[PDB]
Every structure is written in structure tokens, then in C-alpha cells.
Amino acid sequence: KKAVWHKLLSKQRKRAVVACFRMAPLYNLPRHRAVNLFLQGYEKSWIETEEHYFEDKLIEDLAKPGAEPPEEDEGTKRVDPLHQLILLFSRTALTEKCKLEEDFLYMAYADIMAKSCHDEEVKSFEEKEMEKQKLLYQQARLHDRGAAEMVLQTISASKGETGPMVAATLKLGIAILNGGNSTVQQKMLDYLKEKKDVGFFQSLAGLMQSCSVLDLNAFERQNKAEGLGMVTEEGSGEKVLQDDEFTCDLFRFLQLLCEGHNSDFQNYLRTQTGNNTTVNIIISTVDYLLRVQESISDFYWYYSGKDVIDEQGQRNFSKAIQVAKQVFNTLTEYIQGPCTGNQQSLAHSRLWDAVVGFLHVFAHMQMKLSQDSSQIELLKELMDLQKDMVVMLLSMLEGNVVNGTIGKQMVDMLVESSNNVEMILKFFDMFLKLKDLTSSDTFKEYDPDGKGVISKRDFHKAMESHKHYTQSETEFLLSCAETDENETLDYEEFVKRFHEPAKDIGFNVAVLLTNLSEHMPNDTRLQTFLELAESVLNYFQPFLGRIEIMGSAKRIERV
Amino acid sequence: IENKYMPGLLRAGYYDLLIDIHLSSYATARLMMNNEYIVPMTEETKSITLFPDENKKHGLPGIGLSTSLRPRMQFSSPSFVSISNECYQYSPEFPLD
Amino acid sequence: QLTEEQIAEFKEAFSLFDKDGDGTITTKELGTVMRSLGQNPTEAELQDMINEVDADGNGTIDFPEFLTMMARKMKDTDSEEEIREAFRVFDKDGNGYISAAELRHVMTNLGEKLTDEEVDEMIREADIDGDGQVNYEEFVQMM
Amino acid sequence: EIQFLRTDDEVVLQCTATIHKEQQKLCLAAEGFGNRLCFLESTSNSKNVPPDLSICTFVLEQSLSVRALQEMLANHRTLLYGHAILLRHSYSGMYLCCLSTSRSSTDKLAFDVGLQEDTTGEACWWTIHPASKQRSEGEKVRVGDDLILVSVSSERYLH
Amino acid sequence: FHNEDLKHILQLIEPSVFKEAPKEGLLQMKLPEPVKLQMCLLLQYLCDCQVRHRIEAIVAFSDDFVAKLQDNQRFRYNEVMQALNMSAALTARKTKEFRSPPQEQINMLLNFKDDKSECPCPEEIRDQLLDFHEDLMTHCGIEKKSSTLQQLISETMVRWAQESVIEDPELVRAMFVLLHRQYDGIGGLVRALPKTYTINGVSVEDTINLLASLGQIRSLLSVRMGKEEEKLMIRGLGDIMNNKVFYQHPNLMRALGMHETVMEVMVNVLGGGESKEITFPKMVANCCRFLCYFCRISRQNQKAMFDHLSYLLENSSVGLASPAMRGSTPLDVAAASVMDNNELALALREPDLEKVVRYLAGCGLQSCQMLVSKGYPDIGWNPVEGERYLDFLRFAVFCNGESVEENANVVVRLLIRRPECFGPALRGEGGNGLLAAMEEAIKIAEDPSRDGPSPEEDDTIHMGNAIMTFYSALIDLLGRCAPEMHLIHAGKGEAIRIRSILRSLIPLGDLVGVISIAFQMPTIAKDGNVVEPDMSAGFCPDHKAAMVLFLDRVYGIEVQDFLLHLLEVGFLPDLRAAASLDTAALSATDMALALNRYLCTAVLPLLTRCAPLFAGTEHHASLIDSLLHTVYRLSKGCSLTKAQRDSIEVCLLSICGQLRPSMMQHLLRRLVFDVPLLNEHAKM
Ligand SMILES: [Ca+2]
Ligand SMILES: [Ca+2]
Ligand SMILES: [Ca+2]
Ligand SMILES: [Ca+2]
């Protein structure tokens, strides 16, 4: 009786005792401990977060010629302080050492110079032109003094070891190469050719090999820690995808090196004629892409069973998506401007494996994520990755000939990945007929009002009466529709979110398929696949336009 | 150190010898401790302020009240008639003033 | 300084966490209570908890150490306030007197599986006054 | 130009021996009826003794991934290194597996290898691993390669 | 230089900037490059002095600011606690602030910047911080002559650089570093604050002594290792250990970077002469002991020490074979850095385990070179080093009572990939078995020639005991690597697989036989003096404790027949021997203490958790009756500790509770004349 009553008062008392253990107010701590904690907290919260902008002024002052002709020169114009600093940094790199020693002076001044370069709603064309000219001036202020040679010498001396020095050098190179700076590209290419430097490409290949990817074991250990209750001491859970910024910077540097269809440097990357040893950067990029797609497929297979993707895995997927997107952009820039050598190198590479893996991942994640509403941003990132992959595939076929090897290899890849592309194409057709359905008069008679926010039951009856959609399509669209308890859904946002990504990616796929079909006329494996893709081609037929021109290869090309 | 007619090489050598035999040990000891700031919690520490007076004018570097812990300054008299070996610890004394 | 009855109240509370009865609350022994209340404590946290209270450093809280931290908490009158708070939330009827009718709801609330007819039979001795309905006065004597 | 091992293809597991300083080439064999154990048929001396491949031929049914196999157990394709495969004895229709009972062939740790009727379970599945350093996980397995099979159930190499 | 001398000499450097509140100072005199380098050094020192003043002012402000903040939090706590109840304090995100860790609390309090206003501190307290932070920016210059050292340096460096082309890379570097410091005033504080610590006035002398010892140790880096340098190392490390600041302030100890210095003095001595073996072994021993104690001081110390887990693994084989250096080796340092810390155990990676597995395989394949040099009989494998390599994995895979699955699964896979790590008994071909290997170890320990080198006393490794310890450590590691019971019950396929592999590796019969092997008992001699068999040679109770742990965690006792057979063969003899060693003379023997520890730590808890299996034991009456009487007699012991007595009480109260009434008549007959004594032993 009373003991049972005590048991009732025990659960009340159990919380009180554990609460009095747990509750540890700051005022109980001695003065010195609290003072030390305040010093640390003040540092992190205020001093580190305090920001000031001085790089542009500092670089301008260092670049001002300090009245040398007024000074007692009696000879050649003395180099400006910025020129001397860049020369010091270049000589330190050219000095032979076993390892690239970490230098805080370089790691700070490279950042200062990169910020001085970049210095970064609707605006006038005059405003954009002035921004372009000012960026050109700021980049000239450094590559006139020899920063282009320095950013190559440091990479060569790196010997393929990833580190903060290489991370700063890559950012400086990107800053001086932004906008496809032709003068800087020419300076780098001329320097490399005249020095016959093999260490640059050797270090590039080493850095590519050292670049990291997704880690199932690390992610599972982190998730077990979180489940047990451990707090992430590391800032962003960077054990998975160790360096996301470094890989993106490394591939952005190479893409900027080839911007503007710089055929000379594109060919020089594939083969270094003068150098004794040649390294195929174009193939190394494909190898890294093949590893990245394996990592992405690994997370797909991990999260397929899970009902919902948690926020940690969602951000890891995001980071992997930007890495893969940058790699596809770099490959596209390699092969664009009908670079026949690069096209053949990719055609004989392992790129098809990466493409067929991404096709499966894309076909399944489209179905999985569309049902949920919390993964809209992830779905958009995936759509953008799909679009970039299809753009690279289109550049793969640029300058094609009838019955070429590249076209046959694409046809073989498509036959291998037939099922996934079939799913992708049904998805696109399903979300492309939605615009016609919502623009039909039957939708207007179901919702005569101008607000248009129709009930879910009314939408289901409308889609049943439209009878263009089967029962499976109707239930899939119901699952992909997320409405409140009032059943009222915003068809505007629904159709736009599921239409414009479909509208542009499907157009890219239709263009790729038309190109393949026309350049490989008699291929039964291709005609069956076209029959499978009939609906999308019919939808995009009015929009697709084709012409014939006499291309740079002295042959008739179709655009 | 004083002589104005001494050869430059011998002058530099004697300057280096004076620094090494008497000063280098403690100079290195303080250089090794500069980048650490262990300041006790005392009234002198509380009295310290950023600016010497009301107007925000920087004071002369160095002068002021510094309460941060510093290595202690040890010297021993170099006498060769004493037979004690405790003099070997620490650097020989010199007329610092 | 602490009342001898409050010592006895801290006796029973101390033994509440000390199931094995050895007078020492280990980290795992404390951890079982926290998990029973729904909270998932890390092992490192549990050590930090006990270390702050363990003046001896043996890693297990003793009663004299438990009293010192009891004094550190200003639980001067919170004990009967919780008892009074328990009485009102127990009296879901709100009449100020808890009836055997509500006793069937509260047995499910805690999760106890004691049978209802016995609960009425115990409530005939729990009610020494006998009211057939427990007030605050009959609540405190039960506690 | 070079072909790859593919599902629904008949294959024979081939191993070499160095007994008394000569290379003897032996295939894995198993008789469906009667003895479920697996023995070795010598195909090196094909000139004097005809090999009996009718009980050495095996069929590659599935090449599911390791993760797909976890999920499947919890509930034409090209073979890739690091995938779980199912091998069916062509003559008997029973699958190669670790019997989990040992005849004590001088090794207590070793397990017998035989044929099993049921497809369910873990003993039937084997994981292909790259013996050569050139090959890597995820790479297509060529028609001619050296392979090291690993039993999923016991993590014991086909030895 | 103090006061007026500094004033005069700064006026000599620059009359204009440093005038007290025409003439050209040392700066504007067209100086040679070596002189310019030294002026750069002087200007660096002036900036360092400014940074020190700027840090001391911040610490001065922190005192009263933190005092006001603490008073405010006391008041806010009182106000919140008035309305709420003690039980509801677990709830109430209201009181979540007070339940947060102090670092989180103070980070939450210091959120005044911007206008998110989620911080609970009032505006009047906010004002002092918002004024100090702008005064600090003004003093940093981050808010017409130069009139300041910062602007003076910024002008002078640029003027020199544009005046002449400097041919000295050192001068160029110094000038540009100084310019970057002038333009990055925030970075000076960002570097200084993490190295800033505050101490009370009472501990000033102790802090000064600790700093002097640290200074000696640090300055001794520049000199090469030698006898006197080793003496000074050891003396300074002893002083640092004895000082109480080393305990009370681990954060200051990390900020000073002592562990890095101790490793560097260890790195140099270990790397110097790798081919010619480690010199100054007590040096490495002292360094490793200091590093282990540093790990044990605090958890953050342990995390900092964990970052050098790699190097310690290549240097793990420094002094493994040498006796009396237990706990003073780099492997011991690694074990201390990874010991009982789940965060670090999960962060531990596969290659680190692979390195240890490779070392253990090498030790199992190859003999011990210096042991066979000293003349110990040659055997194919190295138990002495194998045991330590196994102990490290035991600490790696098992943490705080239950096993780390991720680490255990990797360790088991590596061990089965390299089967030679198990030892000659368990290689698989011609393996006599664990039980036969342990009787062979008994025979070796009994024979003088095989046990000893047969060509100080602690240096004599008893080979039989080494073999027993190796096998016990291996069995302990595998049992700890066994999966937990909840995963097995849930049906985790990986856990089932691991528990099957371990079962295949170790048969149950061998474990039962090893448990059935009996000890040797101390005996009273003719004169009455007790002769006690040596601990270091022969069969120890810990060896059977490892087997019991393996049997409980892998095979499990779920059948009454198995439980009764095991009680018949292995447990009852040991219990009755302990009950016979209860004489006042034999109680203090090492045999008796070890046996009591073994029983009350391994056997009795197992029989307590297997209590329900004792329900239907009518046919086995004599066995259970003997168990009850023996346990009661053991409880009547004197040398037993409080925990041991409590464990015996729990086991007896469980077994008696499960037994039927007819079983305990004989125990009741013993109790009816012991309970009436009403002594201390009558409570149970
Ligand atoms: Ca206890
Ligand atoms: Ca205690
Ligand atoms: Ca009521
Ligand atoms: Ca009543």
C-alpha cells in the first residue's frame, strides 16, 4: 500500500536526483576555471569571427612602384616589393628538397593575393563589363609579376602530397585563371613547354590519387557514435569525404586551364610531346570519377533500406554531388572543342562504367526521393548532376561520323543500362504529361476558381478522368504530392518542381538519342531503344531543331 | 667592447663571446617562453588596462606593468678558489647595469 | 544540520539508486536509472557526472558524499512540494480526494500490473481514516 | 576484344598443384547422387586418362553485390570483383557450399566443401576476390584470371 | 631595460613615433642588409611586447566580467528554480542551459554579437563586453604622422623594399612576415589566446617550479642524448610528476605542449641507433611512464596522445621482451591512449590493427633473438612479445564492459587471415590443442632446464608461465571479441557468424579441461613455516579466469546438464580448495588471495547469472549440497574483501532462492548453531 505509493513517489524522486546530479551551473566553478573558459569562448566566438578586408589595398600598395626613377637607380628599373615577394616564393619552390615544407608566410600571402584577385540582383551589361575589366586588371597585377610560374612551381615541388600549401596554391591558380584568362593560360603553357617539367604532371596524378571519397566505415562509426549520444567534435563530420574543397579546387584549376577551348593545352594535358615521360591526366580524371561513382553507389545501397535519409547523410550526398559535378564539368571542358584525341582517350577509357553506375543511381533515387518532401534540395542536386552528365555525353558525340566507334560504344552502354534509362524515361514522360493535364480544360472545370489550390480527391478524380495515367502512375503522383489535412495542393509549385528539371533533362536526352539514331542508322539495338523512348521524342519534336553546317574538320556536321 | 680601434673581426668575435658566456642562456630561456602567457590572478593583474589614460593613445611598447610569469634570472660568481661544484649550474655573473 | 528524518529520506533515496545495496553507485548502476527514465547518457558523461560529486575519487558515490551534494541543492521544501504535486496529479478527479475509480487509470499510468481488486483491498488499509477516497492527509501518511 | 565472365555461363574451377616438383592441373568435381563431397579430377594427364568434366561443369546464376546479399538474406549480368556469386552444379542442380561439418583432414579449422539442394542460407554464396594486384574491386572479371573464392558463411578460402 | 632606459633607446630607434607625450633614428639611415635584419628582429620583439600587454588586459577584464556573469546566472537560476520543481528539472529546456556542460553554457552566454538575441544575458552586462571589444579593436588598429608602431613598420618595410632589391632571402622573409603581422592584428590574438592560462595566487610558486622544470627539459633538446642529459631528463620528469599543478591543470599542461616535448626526447633516442638496438633504455621507460600517466590524468590528454598512435605502433617492439619494463613501453603508451575511451576506440582505424596483427604473426612465427642469445631454449614462437601484442588488442576491442563490434569484427578477420598468430597449438596441422599445450607448459615450468636459460631474478622469464600467459591472453582477446548477447538474440547475421567462427576455433572440451586442471596448494613445513609456490612460475588462477570468460561469452551456459557437469569438474574443486586455505596462516598466501579473486570475480557471478538452471536438480543432490556448504565456508573466511563477501552473499541468496526446500536441510543444520551467535557474519 504505502510502499506502492512510495513507488509512485519514487519515479518522481528518481528524476529529481538525476536532475540534481546533471545540473552543474557555471557559478559553482572556481573563478580561474570560469576565466579560462571565458578566454576560450571569447576567442572562438568573437576574435576568430571578427572580419576585416585589407587584401586589395595591401596588394595595391605592394604593387605601387615606390618612386624608383626619383630614387637613385642608375640602372634597370628595380622590381616592386610584390615582384620580390613572388620571386622569393618561386625560388623557395625551385630549391631542391625532399618534401615541400609548410610555410605559413606562403600560406598567408597566397590567400591574400587570391582574395585580391577575386574580390567576391540584376545588373547592367555595362556593370558586368566593368567587373570583367576590373577582374582582368587585378589578375594582371599578379601574373605580370610572375604568379603563374610560381603556382606551377609549387605544385611541381609538392610531389603529389596533399597539404595546405597545395590547397592555397590551387586557390591562387583558380583566382588568376577565373574567366578563362588567355594570357595566363599562354604563360603557363609556355613555361611548361620551355622547362620540360615532368614533376608538374607527376604531382597532379599523385594529388588525384590522394584525393578522398565517401567512406561507409567512417560514416557507420560516426552514426554509431551519434546513436550512443556522442557529439561531433569535428566541425562538419569531415571523416567522410576528407577534403571536399581541395578536390573541387584541383579539378576547377584543370577546367579553367582548358576554358575557351584551349586546344593547345588540352592536347598537352593528354600528351607532353617534349617531355621524356608522359602522364595521361585525361585518364586519371576518369579513374577518379569511377571511384567517386562507386562511393555514391555505396551510399545509395546503404540508404536504400532506410525509409528517410537523415541530415548527415543528406549533406554527405550533397558534397559528393558537387564533387562529381565538378569532375563531369572538367571532363566536358577536356573533350569540348572537337578535341579528337581526348574524345578517343575517353572512348577507350573506363568512363562507360561510371556512366552506367550513375544511370542506375539516377533511375532509383528519382523514384525514392520524389515521394518524400524533405529531400527537394537533394533531388535538385541530383537533377543538375544528371544534366551535366548528359551534357558531357553530348560533347562525347561532338564531331561524330556515320558508324563511328564512339557512337557504337554509347549504344553498347545504353543497351547495358537499358532498364535504368527506361525507368528514367518513364519518370520524365510521367512528369511531362502533367503540364498538359494541369493546362487542360478538365482541370479548370474541376477548379473554376482562380486560386486553383485543388483538393487531393478532386485531383485524383481529374487524373482518373484524364486516363492518360494508369493506376500505378496515379498512385505514384499521389505519393509524390504532399498536401495538408485540408487536401489542398498547390499545383503550380507541384508542376514546376517536377516539370522544369524534367523539361530540360529530357530535352538533353532526346537530343542525345536523335544524334545517336541519325549517326548510327542501321542498328536494331538502337531502334528498340528508340521504340522504348518514343513518347519523349514525340513530346520534344517541335522544340528540337536541327541544321547542317560545314564544320572545322572540312566535313558536313549536323547541329 | 669599448675600443674604437679594434679590428672588425675581433670586435665581432668578442661581442659574440660576451653574449655567449653570460647572456645567451637566459636569452634563449625567455625566447622559448615568449609565446606562452601564464598570468596569475592578482590585484596587479586586475589593475592592468589597455590604455594608460582616458584618451586612446598607445603607450610606449614594453613599459608598463606586466604580471605574466617569466623565467627567473639565475647567476653564479665564477671563482676558482672555491671547491664547491654548485657554481657550475647557472651562467657566470656579469655587471648588467 | 540536516534533519534526521531527512537523513532517513536520503537513506531510501540513496538505496533507490543502489540496487546491489553495497552503498556505492557505479557509473553503470547510475546509467540504468537514466536509461529507465528515457535518457541515453554516454559513458564519458556518466564519469564526468560522478567525478564532480566524488570527492574521494573512488569512482563510486558514497552516502556522506551524497549528503554533501544534497546540501549543495536547495531542496529545502521541494520534497513535500513534490509529494503535494504527486497528490494533485494523482487526483486526476480534481476533487482533492483520489478515488479508487481513478486508481484504475493511474495503475496503467505508471505501468504497474498490480491487480485492481487488491488495490482496493490495500486502499482499505491505506485509508486508515477509511475515506474510500485518499486526500492529502491520507496521502502524506501513505508516503 | 577480351570477354568477361557472365551469368548463366558454364565454367569449371581450375587449380594447379606442384606435387613432386611438377605442375599438375586439377578441376573441382562433385557427384550429385551419393557422395555430396567434392573431389579433384586431374585434367593435366588428358593424354592418358580422359577428364570427366560432366561433373566438373558449374553454372554462374547470380552475381549480386555484397550489400544486395545482406539485404536478400535479411528479407545476363557481368561478374565484377567483390561480388557474391551462386554456383550451380550443372549435372545435379545443387549448389556449391560449405558443409560446415569437417572430416578432420588434419585441420580442425577447415570445413568440407560439397553440394546443397537449398538456395536459401549463406553457405551457398561465395565472394570473388582479385588474386592479381592489377585487378581491383569493381573491375570486370576477365574470362581468364586467377581467383580466390571466399566463403561468406565461414570466411574460409576455397583451399 | 626598464622605464627610462627603454624610453631613451626607443627614441634612438625613432624620435618621432616614440617621442614622450631633424634627428634621424636607426630606421631612417640607409642601413646595410645585416643591420636591417636585426632591426626587423627588434621590431618583432616590440610587437610581441604589445601582444603580451594586449593579452594581459583581456585577462584583467575577464575577471570582473566573469564575476558579473556568474552573479547574474546565480540570480537567474534562483528565479527559475522558484517556479519549477526538482523533478521537472530533467525536462524544461528552460533549465537546459544549466544542464549544459560549462563550455556550452559559456558559449551560449557569449552570443551578444549581431542581434539574434538568444543569449539570456542582460544589456548592462552586454555593454562592458561590447565596449571592451571595440577598445581592443582600436588598440589593434582595426577601426598626419604614423604615430603608431604598426603604421611605422608598415611604412618602413615597404620603403625598404621599394628602395632596394634585397638579395637576402632571410631579410625578405623577415620584412614580409613583419608586414603581415602588422596587417593581421587579429591573428596575433587568435594565436595567443589558445596559449593563455590563468592561475590562482596560491599556485604561483608551484607554477614557476613547473615552468622551470619544463624549461630544463625543453632546453635539453638542443644537446645530444648522454648520461648526464639522461640524469637531467629523469630528475626533471620526476619533479614535474611530483608537482600538483600537473594534476590540477591538465589544460595548461596541454597548452604548454609537454607531451610533444617528451615524445621528441623519446623520438630522438629511439631513432638514434635503430640497427645497434635502443640505447638508454631507462630513458624510454621514463618517457613512456610519463606519457601513460599523462593519458590517465584527463580524457582530453588521452585524445591529444591518440594523434600519435601510428608512430608508437612502429616503435612498439622497443622493449617488449625485456622484463620489469611492463607499463613503460610505446605499446603501453598506445594502450593507455586507447584504453577505456569509446570515442577513440571507434576512431581507431583498420591499418593500426593490421600493424599489430603483423607484429603478432611475426612473433608467432619467429623466436626471440635476445632471449636465445641469453640462452633460453629455442622454440619457434615468441610468447613474451605475443602476450603484450595480444593485450593491446584486448584493450582495443573491449571497452567499458561491452565489446566494440566494429573493432572486434576487424580483429577476428585479421587473426583468421593470419592463423599463425594463434600459436603452435592452434596452427591447425599437428596442433596438440589448447589443453595439451597447457599440460606441456606445466611440464616445462616443472623442468628447470626448459624453464630457465641454464647458461636479474625478475629477468628470468619462466618459459612455461610465458606460454600459459600467451594462451590465456589469446583466449581472453577472442572472448572479448565475441559478440554481445542482445545482437545474437535480435539475429544479427554478422554476430552469429563471428560467434560461429570463435566456436570453430576453440572447442568446448579444451576449455573444460583447462578449467579442470588443478593448482598446487601451499603447505606448512616441518618447522611450521609456510612454503608458498612462486606466482611467476606455474599455473595461475587468471589463466582459468580467461577460459571462464570465453566460455561464458561464446559458448554460454544454457543447459542444466552442462552447468552441473562443469560444476562437478572445474568449479567445485577450486571452491573447496579456497575453503581449505581458510586457516589464519594460509589465508595471507599469494595462492589464496589469487584464488579468492578468481572465484569472486569470475566463477561466483557466473553461477549467480545461471541461477534459474538450478530449479530441477533433485537427482544431483550431493553436488548442490557440497556447493552450498563450500560457499558458506568460504563466506566464513577472514581475508575476504567487502566486494568478495558481497558477491558470495549474492550468489548464495540466488542459488538458495532457486533451490527447492528439501535441498537446503543440510545447510539449515549448519545455520541453526551459527546464526544464534549474532556476530557480524550472521547478517547474510
Ligand atoms: Ca552499489
Ligand atoms: Ca566516492
Ligand atoms: Ca478526487
Ligand atoms: Ca482516508
Residue numbers in the entry:
A (entry chain B): 3583 to 3702, 3710 to 4148
B (entry chain B): 1689 to 1785
C (entry chain J): 4 to 146
D (entry chain C): 10 to 84, 110 to 193
E (entry chain B): 1834 to 1854, 1889 to 2010, 2053 to 2364, 2377 to 2605
Question: What did the publication describing this PDB structure actually write?
Answer:
Ryanodine receptor type 2 (RyR2), an intracellular Ca2+ release channel located on the sarcoplasmic reticulum (SR) of cardiomyocytes, is essential for cardiac muscle excitation-contraction coupling. Structurally, RyR2 is a 2.3 MDa homotetramer consisting of two functional regions: a massive cytoplasmic region, also known as the cytoplasmic shell, which comprises several regulatory domains (NTDs, NSol, SPRYs, RYs, JSol, and BSol domains) and the stabilizing subunit calstabin-2, and an activation core and pore region, which comprises the Ca2+ binding site and the transmembrane domains. Dysregulation of Ca2+ handling, characterized by aberrant SR Ca2+ leak, is a pivotal pathophysiological mechanism in a spectrum of cardiac disorders, including heart failure (HF), atrial fibrillation, catecholaminergic polymorphic ventricular tachycardia (CPVT), and other arrhythmogenic disorders. Here, we solved the cryogenic electron microscopy structures of ryanodine receptor 2 variants linked either to heart failure or inherited sudden cardiac death.
